[PDB]
Amino acid sequence: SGFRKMAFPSGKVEGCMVQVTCGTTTLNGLWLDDVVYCPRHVICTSEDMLNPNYEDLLIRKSNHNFLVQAGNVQLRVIGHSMQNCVLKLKVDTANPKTPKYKFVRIQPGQTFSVLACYNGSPSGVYQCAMRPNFTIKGSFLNGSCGSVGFNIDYDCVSFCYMHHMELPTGVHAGTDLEGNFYGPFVDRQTAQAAGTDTTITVNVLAWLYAAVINGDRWFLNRFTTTLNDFNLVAMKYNYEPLTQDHVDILGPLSAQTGIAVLDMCASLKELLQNGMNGRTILGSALLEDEFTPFDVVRQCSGVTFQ
Amino acid sequence: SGFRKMAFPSGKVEGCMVQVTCGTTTLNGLWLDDVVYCPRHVICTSEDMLNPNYEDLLIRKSNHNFLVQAGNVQLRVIGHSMQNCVLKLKVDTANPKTPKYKFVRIQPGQTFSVLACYNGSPSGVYQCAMRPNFTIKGSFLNGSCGSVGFNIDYDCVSFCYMHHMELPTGVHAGTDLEGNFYGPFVDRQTAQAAGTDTTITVNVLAWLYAAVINGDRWFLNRFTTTLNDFNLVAMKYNYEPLTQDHVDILGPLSAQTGIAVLDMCASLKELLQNGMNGRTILGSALLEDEFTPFDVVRQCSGVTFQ
Ligand SMILES: O=C(Cc1cccc(Cl)c1)Nc1cncc2ccccc12
Ligand SMILES: O=C(Cc1cccc(Cl)c1)Nc1cncc2ccccc12
């Protein structure tokens, strides 16, 4: 029993991290096969970041301007191109530790593990969720740019996030591995606004099911509710509206606990209106939305990977 | 900026996990050099666990009774011995992926990463703390026995914990890598009581310093206090007493924030007496004690490892 914010094992990703240097700037890159992926603003100086013309800047760079180190093994850049907001440095040596991998663009509310890196070397691993406003609430210092987010599906590493910037508000923004930002952000040092952040309701419900699995049942209500009446309460409290697809996803958790999804929603409705009154659920005094229904099934059933 | 419950990268440990089978029982083992370490109750059946005589049980087992698999590579057991509560299975093949490692016995209040495993295969990684009553509040299912806790000190993996059992109360107990239990527990299926659990005060203070580093300063008091007057308040609320060694450890955090340790204690005193009044600190509505002063310095300065 028990429940923890659990990350994926990072071994397969550690052997793909390299440091990329272009002039004075050094950040992390992802070395898969004979291509190194990294944020394109590595070609910028501190002055260029206020209003960078990436095409013009990249023209003044040639293959020998980029320095890729994989520990004490230096790679030679043989070609370079710009795909959206990432640079693709084609190198001579293919990574011998390349795992079976895939590039994926996740949807808001999904979770993934982050391997925070500095100078190409891993520092730590943690789990987080893509917020509905396409930011993440991470833990990043200067030089962490190019650190990647990922999931593991059996033997396959699914890369879904590359870190690019910290907003003036202290939250974090990045791209998929094809260089398309999550959200409306641009890789430029200017004031940028993230939308209103909401709570991922389907995740909160999954977490309440995890609490029931672990013996925390005090919030279980003697009432029920309707999908429309719940959504009317949820939207007052800045919660994501619940759809039928969400009910379908929670089905397995309903069957294991014998508690119908709508009855769980009624318990959530009371928690929203009356608070938690100094009590706790699974050790927390707040409603938690960083666990997807699949995360809960994974942890409470013991799924492993290669 | 930002702050997350961050685990160590697990790659060095993943290549050491193997599955150990003795008769019907299968659990995880740790393969370092030509020795496999695992909980000794792998030699028990479900009936033996109520009152096991481990010496008599081990006598009825020979080297060929143990089946060690490292993926699809079967190891041959050439010798076996019992060191306290762990079994040491000497095998023919030395682990080629053996990292520079060390066996350490941590003290209560220290933190470490857990690589939860099933059938010798990693499932996930999370960070936790050794409680003052020598339990851990983990996330473990049946068959996770033999999963290890560890820290990384540059290139050296420091193994400090091997998981053995879940108590009837739902918390977890285990040994160091020499087989000595943390706490007063025995590897037997009987009702066992853990002591009163207290809060690790030096950790709570480190976390408040992390909050100040990250812009959360509302709890900062216009008062001060004495070490004795604080300890008198802390012991009422089941907090560990603060000593001068704790003040010395927090010194670097004091210098970076310009807030003296005793002034921070005064802020903590008010939080204990008046609660948090629906507010939050670093995203939490409770005082957090699973971050050591070194954890905070590591995360807020960006320490990396090989
Ligand atoms: O924000 C940047 C650089 C940048 C600036 C503007 C635009 C773009 Cl694209 C990138 N780096 C950082 C990323 N994470 C965390 C950081 C913490 C402290 C300082 C910088 C941090
Ligand atoms: O508790 C045991 C076996 C055991 C029993 C008595 C004494 C000893 Cl030494 C070991 N296994 C488990 C360890 N962690 C988590 C578990 C979750 C569910 C079931 C068993 C779990």
Identify the CATH number of the domain in which residue B243 sits: 1.10.1840.10
Whether residue A95 contacts residue A86, with contact meaning beta carbons closer than 8 Å, is answered with no
Which chain B residue's Cα is nearest to A143? B302
Range of the domain at A209: 201-301
d(CA B187, CA B137): 18
Q: B226 in contact with A at a CB cutoff of 8 Å?
A: no
To which H or E segment does residue A209 belong?
Answer: helix A201-213
| Closest approach of B125 to chain A, Cα-based (Å) | 5
Partners of B11 on chain A (C-beta within 8 Å) are: 9-12, 14-15, 122
Q: Rounding to the nearest 10 degrees, give the CA dihedral for residues A49, A51, A55, A59.
A: -60
Nearest to A178 by CA among A194, A159, A192, A165: A159
d(CA A20, CA A198): 36
**CB count, 10 Å around CB of A94?**
12
Residue A160 tokens read as 């879904």
Q: How close is the Cα of B147 to the center of ligand 2, in Å? A: 12
Question: How, if at all, do strands B148-153 and A148-153 pair?
Answer: unpaired
d(CA A224, CA A58): 60
Residue A34 tokens read as 């004979």
To which H or E segment does residue A235 belong?
Answer: helix A227-236
The identity of residue A211, as a single letter, is A
**CB count, 10 Å around CB of B76?**
13
- Burial code (b: 16+ CB inside 10 Å, e: under 16) for B99-110 equals bebeebebebbb
B85 is catalytic: no
What residue spans of A29-105 are helical by DSSP H? 54-59
d(CA A68, CA A88): 12
Partners of B14 on chain A (C-beta within 8 Å) are: 9, 11
B117 is catalytic: no
A57: alpha, beta or left? (left if phi > 0; alpha if psi -120 to 50): alpha
Nearest to A69 by CA among A103, A98, A38: A38
Query: Where residue B75 sits, what CATH number does that domain have?
Result: 2.40.10.10
**At B124, is the secondary structure helix, strand, or coil?**
strand
Q: B84 in contact with A at a CB cutoff of 8 Å?
A: no
Strand partners, B28: B19
